[PDB]
Design a protein around this ligand. Structure first.
Ligand code: ZN
Ligand code: ZN
Ligand code: ZN
Length: 79
């Protein structure tokens, strides 16, 4: 399972995978969520940017790292 109760997700993105950013919820433009963590319920009419990961934009999911987010998130894997 992709659930990670009480800790950060930290799932590394692979080339060609979807990554989710939110203008409002993200602290800065490096703050990202994976497909298993991103919950549409959290971002109704928010400015959500979903990209496809490349060779260059390689990193980790920030779900559960509270210093990466302005609002409390609700992990999609958790429901
Ligand atoms: Zn994640
Ligand atoms: Zn998560
Ligand atoms: Zn949002």
């Amino acid at each position: 399972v992709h659930k990670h109760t009480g800790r950060n997700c930290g799932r590394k993105f692979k080339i060609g995978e979807p990554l989710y950013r939110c203008h409002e919820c993200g602290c800065d433009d490096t703050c990202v969520l994976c497909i298993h963590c991103f919950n549409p319920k959290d971002h109704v009419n928010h400015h959500v940017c979903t990209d496809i990961c490349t060779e260059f934009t390689s990193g980790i999911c920030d779900c559960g790292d509270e210093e990466a987010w302005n609002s409390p998130l609700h992990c999609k894997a958790e429901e």
